[PDB]
Enzyme design. Structure first.
Site, mmCIF file in Angstrom:
data_model
loop_
_atom_site.group_PDB
_atom_site.id
_atom_site.type_symbol
_atom_site.label_atom_id
_atom_site.label_comp_id
_atom_site.label_asym_id
_atom_site.label_seq_id
_atom_site.Cartn_x
_atom_site.Cartn_y
_atom_site.Cartn_z
ATOM 1 N N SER A 190 0.874 -1.169 0.075
ATOM 2 C CA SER A 190 -0.088 0.073 0.041
ATOM 3 C C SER A 190 0.761 1.201 0.008
ATOM 4 O O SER A 190 1.724 1.192 0.699
ATOM 5 C CB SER A 190 -0.903 -0.111 1.043
ATOM 6 O OG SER A 190 -1.467 1.283 1.121
ATOM 7 N N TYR A 232 -2.572 0.069 10.590
ATOM 8 C CA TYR A 232 -2.843 -0.564 8.900
ATOM 9 C C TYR A 232 -1.793 0.030 8.208
ATOM 10 O O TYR A 232 -1.022 -0.829 7.665
ATOM 11 C CB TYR A 232 -4.074 -0.110 8.289
ATOM 12 C CG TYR A 232 -3.906 -0.453 6.875
ATOM 13 C CD1 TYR A 232 -4.552 -1.664 6.321
ATOM 14 C CD2 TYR A 232 -3.988 0.666 5.753
ATOM 15 C CE1 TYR A 232 -4.283 -1.947 4.831
ATOM 16 C CE2 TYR A 232 -3.833 0.244 4.357
ATOM 17 C CZ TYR A 232 -4.125 -0.992 3.945
ATOM 18 O OH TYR A 232 -4.047 -1.443 2.522
#
Lengths: 240, 246, 240, 246
Positions: free
Chosen positions: D149, D163
């Site tokens: 990501s 996250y």
């Protein structure tokens, strides 16, 4: 990569090494490839034969892209022949000799930066309006791909400081170009080759292992949402 | 930072901005500071008075370091005055204009790259011999500190592409110099300002404001002192209110 | 660093190594330093003497910060003693053993991540309201400093993958905290130690060469406009 | 990508989104794809029909890979069916909620880290032996591809800190695995999406829109093929419309 059929791709420094291997791989998908070098190759027609044998077409254009006037001439000549540019590949570059800091003079600095800096700047500059036109007509994107280096990231070898810096220069100017030109639907990406025991794979790469990355970045179908990125192809030599 | 007393620190572009603030802060620890600009300040005696009032000393040397000959001359002048160099601060640099890519010509490219590329290369080249000699005599390290930029990392603003690239050029050439010159006990570090003294740029900064020169100077002092940073080389400290967190 | 006089600084894992050296260096500028370890040191009063000899003050708090309840207890105990927190230094951490990927089980993963991940998360969490209060009262900033690692950047040694990853985890969560908490005038920065022939300086660092970086990041006068940064202290082992 | 014909590719979290699109695109080159989700899709036969219509084959395996026991079981089930693994795609993961730091408790931390950390670690652990055997038999390389990501690089959005951190964790553990397993001819690469299908996030993206799953899949195909990427390992390809240019 079926969307590469008929795409007009100008590759600087493409009569040998990575550039020629890339030209051939693109031609396998029907690309029309402009080959270039500062010197005439021994057998220009043979290179053209390899492009056509692979399934594409092209031409050879001699031009010394260390000079801005020559960059302008090369772009104009390519567009005169093929009526536009869909992809520019800035591949011409190299060390241009080795020198420890204390022996570097203006001539050395000028030589290395003209080959790796001025050339890429001006080739891209003159290509922009044609790349803009290409993307407008296709309704997709056009693309710039530039050959970077591991040296951009970790300083390069002793004696190769100016070269290494010129590649960091390239990696960062692409970031600027993303800001300016994404609105024109022009993408910018970099393939960064490595240079043996400092390489996890325990060997140097071959030109055949480099070419597919260029094809990937050239195809809108493959990389249409990808811009401003660097893919290092180096057997794990650096994991950035 | 008591180990800065008497240290001879040549700072390019130090008659204003970050360079002048850094000069004064170093003078507070007794440093001997070489001030420099490409043009004459309207009264050098006043600037030197501030260095002495702070608790240090120094001199002013005019030199246009976009020219390699001027880089040699500046190093020679500073060494003529103080016999050597203990810290070189490559602070001279700047945008030298903005241009969209399609309006960039050879002159624009040459100007930005001479100001930010050629200058730091040649200043460092001519200083290194003296920095080597300095480190040998002291038995510690000598130092190069160069002013980088956030633009080295994320491409800079529209029109600032060549400037941005020239700062990435600097950040990476420092990595090369670590490989070549760590054996000579010379350290190389970068202070990378973000935005130093518009609403859009401020909103991109978590602290919600531009930096001041007083907020930049301490990083240079830290990198100049062997006691503080003697095991630190090849690093970049970004001073930018969180504008980029690399 | 005159603005460190009287600053209340809680350092986890500070009875030995980098933590103790940092505590002493901060105490030299008049800081009031909370020392901590999961085990009682041999001579707690001696450590306190070194802080006071240097020119500061402090106390020792035993707490196992791998457990969230203990992080809460440590923060509450420190604030009970000194009425607030001006700087938090997340220094507790470490390899907690070595294991190649194929031998890693849940226990190993839990052990390493509790020591390097959960601890830092929860210590910082419980400190935030006190750090918020500190900055509001001083009208300047309060600070968090965390001990990172070279391993965050290049994967660490074989067998140390989870540790290395936990440090990358730390480096990145600081970036998130900058976004959330800069509005509270809380700064976040990292000191990243290295690990001999792969080190340009040809030697390992000493704790005395690490401490000054912490002092720098702790002082608003020195680093008030600096947040979200990592200073690697590694003799050139990596030049990121 | 003719060298993908018959290649056995296990993709975690592949009944929807990027995973499903990647599965279909691989099937177009004749790949044999293991579909997986922690919960049953409402009709697996339809998904498998699409793989076969594309020109490949596969099977569906339900497993909640937040549990280490389930990771072992999934690898065992896939190997029971196809005798081995040529490519592992660690695509399962996600936010698993948002929380400001002061509201994060142990449960929140455990949930996000099991989903994004423990899962990829244990899936890769259990697959590696089979990937090693695969590479030895073919004389080329086997591959791990993991979904990273943008948040690994710049901290993610407010509430997404754990996250974000878990993705940085992944990006870096891949670097470790390159050191340990390159000798076994296993390659490790990451596809790092930006934003895939609000106005504020779109304005932060140079292309001015979120990505589609069809724009993500080709990167996985590229990393899966030894012919395309056989000399590429330890790399991260960000697919984000210019949202970050690292």
């Amino acid at each position: 990569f079926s969307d590469l059929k008929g795409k007009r791709i100008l590759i600087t420094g493409s009569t040998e090494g990575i550039g020629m291997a890339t030209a051939i791989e693109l031609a396998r998908y029907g690309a029309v490839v402009g080959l270039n070098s500062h010197v005439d190759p021994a057998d220009p027609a043979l290179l053209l034969g390899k492009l056509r044998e692979a399934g594409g077409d092209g031409a050879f254009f001699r031009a010394d892209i260390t000079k801005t006037a020559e960059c302008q001439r090369l772009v104009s000549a390519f567009v005169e022949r093929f009526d536009g540019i869909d992809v520019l590949i800035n591949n011409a570059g190299g060390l241009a000799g080795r020198s420890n800091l204390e022996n570097i003079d203006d001539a050395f600095y000028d030589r290395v930066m003209d080959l790796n800096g001025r050339s890429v700047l001006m080739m891209t500059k003159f290509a922009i309006p044609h790349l803009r036109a290409s993307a407008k007509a296709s309704g997709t994107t056009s693309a710039v791909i530039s050959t970077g280096s591991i040296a951009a990231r970790e300083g390069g070898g002793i004696g190769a400081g100016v070269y290494a810096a010129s590649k960091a220069w390239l990696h960062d100017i692409h970031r600027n170009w993303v800001k300016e030109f994404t609105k024109d639907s022009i993408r910018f990406n970099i393939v960064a080759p490595g240079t043996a025991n400092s390489i996890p794979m325990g060997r140097f790469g071959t030109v055949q292992e480099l070419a597919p990355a260029y094809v990937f970045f050239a195809s809108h179908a493959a990389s249409g949402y990808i811009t401003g990125q660097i893919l290092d192809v180096n057997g794990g030599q650096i994991c950035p």
